[PDB]
Scaffold this active site. Structure first.
Site, PDB file in Angstrom:
ATOM      1  N   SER A 106       0.753  -1.242  -0.071  1.00 18.38           N
ATOM      2  CA  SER A 106       0.075  -0.116  -0.091  1.00 18.38           C
ATOM      3  C   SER A 106       0.895   1.198  -0.151  1.00 18.38           C
ATOM      4  O   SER A 106       1.839   1.251   0.465  1.00 18.38           O
ATOM      5  CB  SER A 106      -0.849  -0.030   1.281  1.00 18.38           C
ATOM      6  N   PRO A 107       0.441   2.384  -0.405  1.00 19.17           N
ATOM      7  CA  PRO A 107       1.251   3.610  -0.499  1.00 19.17           C
ATOM      8  C   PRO A 107       1.339   4.240   0.805  1.00 19.17           C
ATOM      9  O   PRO A 107       1.825   5.310   0.754  1.00 19.17           O
ATOM     10  CB  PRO A 107       0.569   4.595  -1.702  1.00 19.17           C
ATOM     11  N   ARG A 108       0.845   3.547   1.767  1.00 24.26           N
ATOM     12  CA  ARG A 108       1.124   4.131   3.105  1.00 24.26           C
ATOM     13  C   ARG A 108       2.316   3.656   4.107  1.00 24.26           C
ATOM     14  O   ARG A 108       2.908   4.141   4.850  1.00 24.26           O
ATOM     15  CB  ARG A 108      -0.239   4.294   3.968  1.00 24.26           C
ATOM     16  N   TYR A 109       2.636   2.128   3.618  1.00 22.83           N
ATOM     17  CA  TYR A 109       3.325   1.243   4.212  1.00 22.83           C
ATOM     18  C   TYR A 109       4.867   1.211   3.782  1.00 22.83           C
ATOM     19  O   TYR A 109       5.804   1.611   4.652  1.00 22.83           O
ATOM     20  CB  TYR A 109       2.976   0.036   4.389  1.00 22.83           C
ATOM     21  N   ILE A 110       4.995   1.192   2.437  1.00 23.88           N
ATOM     22  CA  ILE A 110       6.369   0.920   2.019  1.00 23.88           C
ATOM     23  C   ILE A 110       7.222   2.015   1.797  1.00 23.88           C
ATOM     24  O   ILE A 110       6.754   3.183   1.632  1.00 23.88           O
ATOM     25  CB  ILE A 110       6.176  -0.043   0.542  1.00 23.88           C
TER      26      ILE A 110
END
EC number: 5.6.2.2
Lengths: 492, 492
Positions: free
Chosen positions: A97-101
């Site tokens: 997801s674009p919030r974790y990686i």
């Protein structure tokens, strides 16, 4: 535009947007290589480089440029990615997801693949009166045909099957070094437009093989037969087909499902491992049905582990325009002289800057010597000091361009740096006429003159300038790819 | 400590926390007078001034210091407030919400009431190794008995009934100016500890009146009688009693409710307007019941519109300690000499700084003149330049204290400013020896010497130093209070 974006240049293999991504990344992590999250970096991109589209395609292409999986379109990750960015086993597109990686620029490679000093040298496209991207980068290797591409694209299906690594190493070390026996023979070949050296597709982390038939190459995977358990073990695939798509393609053909009993998936993107139990009298009736030829056996006809590697290579030339190719040899031919011309412009610009630095520092130490004769502390106008320092031999200098020679042509570098105010002599109160500073400035003049002489040596290098620099840089890129791939893009 | 917080100093009428509020406000709105909200300002306070308690009492006391209602404890709003900060009609404590109302420092008054230059001069209490509040401010007026205070406090009920304005104006203009006929007569009085001048409580926006009986004053309000409608109209109250508390106090006494029919409240904190309809034959039976005396009539006994103004004045002296008072005259006596001593220290410090500035700038222009003889560009050490500039008459200067003379005693100002490096002559390359700068530095020496002569005149001012300064400053405070009172602390 759409053709201009989805078909790359023959110098990058990348879009304008991908070059914008890389430019904003170098702009970002220069001072500190601490890993961001994806959206912060994407906001940095869309602010700075003017990413002219929506952030969905931005984050999409960024994670596309972080796709480190065996069989990606990148053998060379532009960005060190930390997280979970995908799996060929599940079709490739199963990122996080674009919030974790986290993304991070691999500058320890990029300083070597992209000439960091020559970043200034590139013909930029300064639109909107502001700093924008390279029209095209120039890498040390010819990167634009070193990595795969398999996409529905404008005009044609974009298809770049890879080459090897050391084949292009041999080709370019041949074209540079005269210690090649084939050196002038390579010049003979390029002059006569003939092919003389092996130019093989990739083999890294692919245990199948190739052959040539006609013009095409056919790629084969592997299998293991055991009619004891009546199970075939598939361990190798053709080039870049996902696992689930293959198993579903096996379950497509009901004509072959007449003996297909049981398909068990032990595979991963790490290891391909498929166990297929079949009916009794499978293989013999397959031989009775499938016409076993030279180009495929009964198993290679049945499981379909071969591939015809057709290609489409019709790229986009700089200064506008599309150039359409036929062979890889044409691409290497087109790739060489631009890098040659870049080294020429590089060392000519450095020669101009060393001229102007030695001129300014000589004039400064001359004033420090003539502190006694001048002693002009009975003046009250600055233009008075301008005229009297124009008497005793001190040249007009635009030191703004002298300290930082940004982005210019060499002619404007020598023209408009010599047309400025004398403020470098001047600014404030007293003590810098003391001779220890004079001594260290003389040390600077000595090192600058020695560096100037080394430059004037390398101006006259055979057969084209700067060739030993380019041998050193290919040595550095060799060190970089060894350090990367032999640690497999961990850099630890 | 609770006594130390809830009983103020005789120099402030404020807490240590209130002085912290004012100090943080001057620290905040110095660069720009753009209003915050309450919570931002309170956070600024609690961070900066080390506000040693919780933000509830902080926002409480801040909105207490923004209380501008007729009959507040502040005749002088420290802060211009935008919002709705209370109403005497509803008991005073009906402010707005701390996240929607705005406070703003009224610096156009505070520069005059608090000497902005002498902010450096105050004996601070630098606890925790860092910057903290004044031990006590010093105002131009004696503010600490110019505003009311009526609170349940430590030791005693804190009670400061106000004085007038122009009585204290006359007292202090008498103590300063020798153009007073009573000037030496006032010195005669203060020497003999006698009271000679009128010292009246406030009258601003209070249309009731006062008389003396015994020692006290009694305050009377107003009433209008109409037995046509049998309605008394109350328009004036005693000093600082809320409206609703008064009406409920009227409805307390059932003995007086024997004729109380109807109480209608048309009042506000702006205007007091209460209409009381009574029973038929109320007043005559009241005269038959209430004994009408000199000190109150039947109406003043009935409605109870009088007040005995008892006081409690036992304040906290600086350098630790509580000083306990008897008269306002004692307070004015104690107030004078500290402001006198502050002017003395002020002009002595300014004299020391003007000494050191003239010394440094003379030494600088001497070096500019001796550029020719020195010409010492054949040196290589800085200590060599130190010794040789110690030959030709250039004094060791600690210019750090010279440029900014912070917080010091005058003796340390003259000691340790003369013990530093010669870097003011020195640090960079040359051009400041060009003599237009020399000319403007000479202009600076001329203005500094003229200002020094004016200082040395004002050192000898009769009968104590700086008295004409203090007349000018009381003139400015007069301008400020008249400007505010004509604008009702809107300043527009």
């Amino acid at each position: 535009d759409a053709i201009e974006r989805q078909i790359p240049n023959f110098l990058d293999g990348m879009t304008r947007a991908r070059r914008k991504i890389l430019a904003g990344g170098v702009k970002c992590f220069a001072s500190n290589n601490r890993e961001r999250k994806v959206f912060q970096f994407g906001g940095y991109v869309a602010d700075h480089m003017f990413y002219h589209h929506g952030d969905m395609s931005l984050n999409t292409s960024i994670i596309k440029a972080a796709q480190y999986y065996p069989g990606s379109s990148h053998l060379y990750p532009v960005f060190i990615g930390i997280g979970s960015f995908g799996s060929r086993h599940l079709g490739g597109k199963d990122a996080g997801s674009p919030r974790y990686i986290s993304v991070q620029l691999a500058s320890e490679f990029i300083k070597t693949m992209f000439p960091a000093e020559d970043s200034w040298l590139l013909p930029y496209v300064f639109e909107d009166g502001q700093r924008a991207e390279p029209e095209y980068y120039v890498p040390v290797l010819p990167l634009a045909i070193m990595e795969y591409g398999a996409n529905p694209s404008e005009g044609w299906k974009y298809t770049t099957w890879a080459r090897q690594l050391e084949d292009i190493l041999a080709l370019v070390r041949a074209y540079v070094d005269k210690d090649n026996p084939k050196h002038e023979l390579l010049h003979y070949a390029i002059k006569h437009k003939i092919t003389i050296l092996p130019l093989r597709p990739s083999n890294y982390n692919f245990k199948g093989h190739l052959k040539r038939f006609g013009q095409y190459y056919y790629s084969y995977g592997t299998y293991v037969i055991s009619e004891q358990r009546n199970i075939i073990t598939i361990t190798e695939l053709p080039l870049r087909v996902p696992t689930v798509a293959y198993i579903e393609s096996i379950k497509k053909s009901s004509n072959r499902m007449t003996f297909i009993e049981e398909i068990i998936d032990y595979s991963s993107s790490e290891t391909i491992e498929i166990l297929v139990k079949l009916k009794p009298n499978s293989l013999n009736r397959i031989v009775e049905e499938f016409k076993e030829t030279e180009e495929q056996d009964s198993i290679e006809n049945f499981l379909r582990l071969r591939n015809c590697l057709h290609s489409h290579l019709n790229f986009v030339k700089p200064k506008g325009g599309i150039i359409e190719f036929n062979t890889y040899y044409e691409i290497l031919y087109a790739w060489l002289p631009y890098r040659r011309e870049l080294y020429q412009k590089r060392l000519m610009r450095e020669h101009a800057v060393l001229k102007l630095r030695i001129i300014m520092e000589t004039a400064i130490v001359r004033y420090i010597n003539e502190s006694a004769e001048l002693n002009l502390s009975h003046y009250e106008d600055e233009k008075e000091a301008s005229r009297i320092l124009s008497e005793h031999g001190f040249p007009p200098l635009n030191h703004t361009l002298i300290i930082s020679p940004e982005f210019a042509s060499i002619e404007e570098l020598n023209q408009k740096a010599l047309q400025g105010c004398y403020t470098y002599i001047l600014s404030l109160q007293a003590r810098e006429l003391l001779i220890a500073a004079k001594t260290r400035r003389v040390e600077k003049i000595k090192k600058m003159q020695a560096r100037l002489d080394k430059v004037e040596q390398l101006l006259q290098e055979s057969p084209f300038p700067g060739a030993s620099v380019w041998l050193e840089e290919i040595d550095a890129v060799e060190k970089a790819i060894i350090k990367g791939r032999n640690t497999q893009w961990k850099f630890h």
